[PDB]
């Protein structure tokens, strides 16, 4: 039981998070209203304190005379689906007969979007996203040739047996998620569900994943957070003898179902490698156009 | 519950069956170790002995509680106190008692 | 009387007699982890008044040409105080924060800082230069301490990101026309309920002057800057020996 | 980690070693999510 | 000895806070488990062999 | 049914299956200060779980020859986990304590323990032997930490009283051929509401044989006496920077 | 407010000391009851366990075949007013005319009563007391003589200026309770309150009055608490020229409205020093009487 009164009036323990706004409904523009001339004193719009951290309140009624407009443009194609359920290039998979890379009829792609720019820069908007999506899986020759081959792309999560050939065990695929496909047929298409261990992925981690002493040759591993390392996706030409022709396999995804939190600054330096943030120091360029002059054009 | 194979360090196929059980016996009461292990229970070490650890492999992720029970095989006569200590995440293997 | 404030938490107390009102993050006060959220069964530990209250760690001279700083949360208190030493006890940690920017001058100095807070700030480097070279900071860059760091590139934040935009997070200015302090209440900004105050740095704290700080020859040239925090609902779970890394 | 609090004693006439077995299992808070293979295929070759 | 496993709970080993569990069992099922294709069987055809 | 027992208390449980039930000093269990008993006007700190915990500090063996040891309260734990924390960062502390003694042989040995509570065991020297010089015991003696100090003439406990007579304090007797541990459940005593956990040890904890440890050749020899102890409704007042004496 | 559940039912600020035991009305010992014989299995009130820490259960009822006996004897006797509101000798202060110690007409004593070994060993039963005293004054010559001569003694509290002369300012008292008496007249005697800053005194304090490091040359301060420090009791001859007669003052105390608390082991070695129980290391003694051999009277 309690007794003391500084332990019976605490405030420790609460769990509800004292939200300081709402949402409203907001299907249209805001509309405008009538106005007319003001000449007041003690009344002024106008004048702001930006120190403050908040932005403007001043509305167009309040700055000029305007009349009365209604305003029914939709606010519908502006919402985190409509910006982002739009399928785009995220990773490519190439399977030459004759090469340096995969020669041997297989390749081990560890799943992460962050190789193209396009879809690279809208995501990492937000720093925490949470959503489904649908993968597309385009294959064809290099020339864009189709050919009667067969495919299988399997889902290798994190622990399971990686494939180390086009004959490996592992392709047997009694647990593991797997697609057999022609590259006749039309491109593969699949839906992903949310499947990272925390209750959403993060474009940005400021931290470790271990402890210790973070030496020099392990700074590679700042900014990792395997809670977004959902493992491998592997693809595999079907037979035990090698293909007689060489595969590119595009990876288009689809997110939907999205939800985002805290909005960031969005890049404008080039990206250089798909872990970090890393830009070129001597290329440092202005985050747009620049002129001659302030005074003119 | 299934035998978790804390003592896995023999390999010849003659002394498999040691690895089933550890031992303990008279000391000089400077609070010396017996033994050590982790508890990841998908990881390779003592767990892959248990079903929990084979079973455990085919799931990618896991969440829960685990529980480990130590039965002493020794004589009736003899007596002991045993500190059974679990060190969560960051905590180096503890150097003493 | 949105000038003058008063912040009392613990055994301290902040007076101010030019504020320019608080920013509360997000819009939402920190509170404790809710049954629901948490995962992890221990009871937790609140230390409550000997934790959260308000710490005074750091003092940077503002220049002239003053480039910018960034200090690290939970990071800078880690081996401070009783905060410290649960943190270092603790593998779990989750909190919220008061920050309390302070910087006073005269009304014939000039000068405007950007006081903001950029959760999961990640920091890049300029890769060799040419951007050929896959470089990566070191563990005194990216985690500080009390003493901060100060920004090579400003313009985008070590980053690749533009400060022009730095406003879209919880932020406030120092305009010294206007007021000699920020105060910004963050809630706890995380994809977990709980984490370890070691490993991960929830956001980082910028203080970039954006107007120059300027003053006529025979006027106080020491302009200091001082970061004053005090956690807010502090909480602690897996307990064992202390670590400090 | 397993350490001895006071001593193993025992009286004249009993063994000076013996032997602990340890059983393992999960709380009826445990689940498992995202099904896959596991890391061992318990096969060299072909399985006449 | 007596073949059953332990009784003990977390409750009755440390200080526990409450911990609202949603953690879904659906994906331990036998169907979950086994209702995955997978290779059982290869048969050759080959011209000359 | 009074033989078996199990403490447990934060994250530490401790099990006996040969205990003698369980002593609770003055037959009155630890509280917190009342708002009419305190005087101190800050609010306090109750760390709980990280501090009410069981802490082992040490094992002595005991021998056919030994005098006994005895520890002092709170000076074993001041410098172990989070509660030496909060004692050396706080002017201000108080709580009660559960200690549990630890003691096992075979049933073929034989001896009996005395465990022991005595609040305020002031220590006393030889007086140079003849008592014609003014000694006094030094700090190792007074406050040994969690080593603890044997005693020199166990008769008089080190301080011209009678041991004979300490069973008018809390205790309990380890006798092997019934018991292993011993266990006694202290409540705050002092005529302050509050004290230093420093400059202050409240009592005093004696574990000193008397009737020899006896066994036959051949017989495991190594008796080790282990002290285990916890403290229960930690109380912390008066914050400023930590200090260890 | 409160929400998450461990907070709502800690019991976190219970200043509620559960009790055990209570007290019980005994004014008298307690009677005996008519007995007979048994002969029970499974009843066993003479086996005991004093490992347990607790004294026997065992009555004389269950061990031997009583009769009734209404006992009337009373327990008033033994009640800590009783035995301790009985006036003994806490101090002694000469006033010689030649001599080396307090010949300038005045003497200043220290408040403290454990420079005589009768009173000392009785309060040293206790480790804490509160308690009002009563304080008796007999002066006289070395001879016992009762000579006509006026005295003046002075309560001096911690801060207050120390005579340091029979004509000292200090001695204008004019807030200091002073009592002026003669030899002729009978003993002063007056009542004093419980003066401490603590809710009791306390005959053992195994602590330290400071902080810092306690080196060898402080370890004279260990076991020293200020709460036991009343300050000091001055006593002067009245008058600018010296005294014609040698003096003697005994100071006796009566405790009365006596609480105490945790009992102690009593004093077995004999006392040497005031501040500390330090004993003859060379002539440790049992605490009683011996015998050549246990099978023998
Ligand atoms: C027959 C079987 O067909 N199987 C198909 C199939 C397809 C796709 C699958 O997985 C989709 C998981 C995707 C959406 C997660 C992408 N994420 C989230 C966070 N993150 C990330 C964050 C910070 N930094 C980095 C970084 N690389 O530096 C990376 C990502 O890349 C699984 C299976
Ligand atoms: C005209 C004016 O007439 N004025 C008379 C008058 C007489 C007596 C007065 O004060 C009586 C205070 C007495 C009762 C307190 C005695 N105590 C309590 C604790 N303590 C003590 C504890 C541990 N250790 C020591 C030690 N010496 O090592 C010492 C004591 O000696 C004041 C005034």
Chains 1, 7 share one sequence.
């Not at chain 1, 982002?84 to 030459?96: N, Q, T």
């Not at chain 1, 595969?247 to 890049?267: D, G, T």
């Not at chain 2, 982790?38 to 929990?52: C, E, F, I, K, V």
Request: proline share 7%.
């Amino acid at each position: 039981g309690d007794r003391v009164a500084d332990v019976i009036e605490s405030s420790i323990g609460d769990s509800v998070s004292r939200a300081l706004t709402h949402a409203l409904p907001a299907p249209t523009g805001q509309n405008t209203q009538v106005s007319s001339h003001r000449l007041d004193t003690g009344k002024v719009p106008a004048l702001q304190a930006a120190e403050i951290g908040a932005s403007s309140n001043a509305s167009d009624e309040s700055m000029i005379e305007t009349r009365c407009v209604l305003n029914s443009h939709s606010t519908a194609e502006t919402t985190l689906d409509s910006f982002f359920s739009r399928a785009g290039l995220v990773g490519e998979i190439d399977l030459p007969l004759e090469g340096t890379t995969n020669p041997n009829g297989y390749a081990n792609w560890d799943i992460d979007i962050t190789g193209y720019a396009q879809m690279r820069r809208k995501v990492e908007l937000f720093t925490y996203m949470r959503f489904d999506a649908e993968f597309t899986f385009v294959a064809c020759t290099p020339t864009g040739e189709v050919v009667p081959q067969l495919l299988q792309y399997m889902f290798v999560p994190p622990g399971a047996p990686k494939p180390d050939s086009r004959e490996s065990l592992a392709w047997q695929t009694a647990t593991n998620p797997s697609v057999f496909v022609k590259l006749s047929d039309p491109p593969a298409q699949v839906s992903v569900p949310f499947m990272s261990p925390a209750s959403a992925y993060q474009w940005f981690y400021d931290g470790y994943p271990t402890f210790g002493e973070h030496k020099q040759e392990k700074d590679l591993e700042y900014g990792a957070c395997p809670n977004n390392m959902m493992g491998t996706f592997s693809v595999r030409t079907v037979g035990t003898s090698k293909s007689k022709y060489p595969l590119v396999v595009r990876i288009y995804m689809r997110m939907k179902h999205v939800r985002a939190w805290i909005p960031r600054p969005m890049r404008n330096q080039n990206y250089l490698f798909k872990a970090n943030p890393n830009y070129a120091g001597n290329s440092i360029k202005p985050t747009g156009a620049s002129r001659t002059a302030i005074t003119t054009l | 519950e299934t035998i978790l194979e804390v003592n896995n360090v023999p390999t010849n196929a003659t002394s498999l069956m040691e690895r089933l059980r550890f031992p303990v016996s008279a000391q000089a009461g400077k609070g010396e170790l017996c033994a050590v292990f982790r508890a990841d229970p998908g990881r390779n070490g003592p767990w892959q002995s248990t079903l929990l650890g084979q079973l455990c492999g085919y799931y990618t992720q896991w969440s829960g509680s685990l529980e480990v029970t130590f039965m002493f095989t020794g004589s009736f006569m003899a007596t002991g106190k045993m500190l059974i200590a679990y060190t969560p995440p960051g905590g180096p293997l503890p150097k003493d008692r | 009387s949105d000038r003058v404030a008063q912040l009392t938490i613990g055994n301290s107390t902040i007076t101010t007699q030019e504020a320019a009102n608080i920013i509360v993050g997000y819009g939402e006060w920190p509170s404790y982890c809710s049954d629901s959220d948490a995962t992890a069964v221990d009871k937790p530990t609140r230390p409550d008044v000997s934790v959260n209250r308000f710490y005074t760690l750091d003092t940077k001279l503002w220049e002239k040409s003053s480039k910018g700083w960034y200090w690290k949360f939970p990071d800078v208190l880690t081996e401070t105080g009783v905060f410290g030493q649960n943190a270092q006890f603790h593998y779990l940690y989750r909190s919220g924060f008061c920050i309390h920017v302070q910087c006073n001058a005269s009304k014939f100095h000039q000068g405007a800082l950007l006081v903001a807070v950029l959760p999961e700030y990640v920091i890049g480097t300029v890769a060799g230069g040419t951007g050929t070279e896959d470089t990566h900071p070191p563990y005194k860059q990216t985690q500080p301490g009390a003493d901060g760091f100060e920004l090579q590139h400003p313009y985008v934040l070590d980053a690749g990101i533009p400060i022009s935009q730095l406003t879209v997070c919880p932020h406030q200015w120092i305009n010294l026309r206007t007021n000699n302090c920020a105060t910004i209440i963050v809630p706890y900004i995380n994809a977990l309920p709980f984490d370890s105050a070691l490993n991960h740095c929830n956001f980082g704290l910028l203080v970039v002057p954006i107007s120059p700080l300027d003053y006529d020859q025979g006027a106080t040239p020491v302009i200091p800057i001082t970061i004053t925090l005090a956690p807010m609902c502090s909480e602690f779970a897996g307990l064992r020996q202390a670590v400090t890394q | 980690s397993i350490w001895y609090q006071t001593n193993y004693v025992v009286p004249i006439g009993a063994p000076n070693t013996a032997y602990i077995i340890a059983l393992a299992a999960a709380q009826k808070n445990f689940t498992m999510k995202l099904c896959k293979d596991a890391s061992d295929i318990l096969q060299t070759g072909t399985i006449q």
